[PDB]
């Protein structure tokens, strides 16, 4: 719920709307936002790379018995979305580029 | 010889692993459908079964779960390696289904 205090968080918007928003802010490489998946406790990171918006699914899992999030089916795990974003500003991980600029 | 289950479905593997206790590190290897060349590593972690594709390629024939970053000449070597080391896995393999 802290991700709601983040400006890169757009809550529940469609893929189309996320690509319009990223377009509006100039399709800069590493321009990104995070949003709700249409069908829960799941999210999409929408990221511009080489003038294209790509979409990375972030899925929740439990663990004794607390939720974490992952983009790689649990190989890399995060307590919350802020941790995930902050990680990927510095490390590409599975992404094609760093997260460089917030899409507001 | 135990861990290789020839061909069985994904579900069939989930049921086999299930009825052996859903324990951490409980695992089996199976052939895929298809890719007759392909294989799958069915592994239980947190009472959940996950399935890791094992694909062959050529440089020299090798298998990989991660597109060539980590290579094995055959399935046995991959298994033995992952008894000691996690690799891309969530836990070590230690129990044969």
């Amino acid at each position: 719920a802290i991700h709601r205090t983040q400006l890169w968080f757009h809550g529940r918007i469609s893929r189309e709307e996320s690509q319009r928003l990223i377009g509006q802010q100039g399709l800069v490489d590493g321009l990104f936002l995070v949003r709700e998946s249409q069908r829960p406790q799941g999210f999409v990171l929408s990221l511009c790379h080489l003038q294209k918006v790509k979409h990375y699914l972030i899925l929740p899992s439990e663990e004794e018995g607390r939720l974490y999030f992952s983009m790689d089916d649990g190989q890399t795990r995060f307590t919350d979305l802020l941790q995930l974003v902050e990680f990927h500003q510095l490390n590409r991980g599975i992404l094609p580029c760093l997260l460089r600029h917030c899409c507001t | 010889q135990l861990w290789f289950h020839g061909r069985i479905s994904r579900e069939e593997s989930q049921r086999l692993i299930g009825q052996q206790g859903l324990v951490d590190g409980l695992f089996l290897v199976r052939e895929s459908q298809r890719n007759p060349q392909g294989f799958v590593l069915s592994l239980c972690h947190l009472q959940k079964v996950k399935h890791y594709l094992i694909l062959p390629s050529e440089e020299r024939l090798y298998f990989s779960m991660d597109d060539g970053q980590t290579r094995f000449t055959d399935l046995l070597q991959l298994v033995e390696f992952h008894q000691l080391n996690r690799g891309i896995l969530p836990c070590l393999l230690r129990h044969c289904c």
Binding site: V44, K54, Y56, L57 | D66
Partner: peptide
């Protein structure tokens, strides 16, 4: 992978 997304990682 995840069908419909751009996730790429060890499968």
């Amino acid at each position: 992978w995840f069908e419909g997304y751009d996730n790429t990682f060890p499968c």
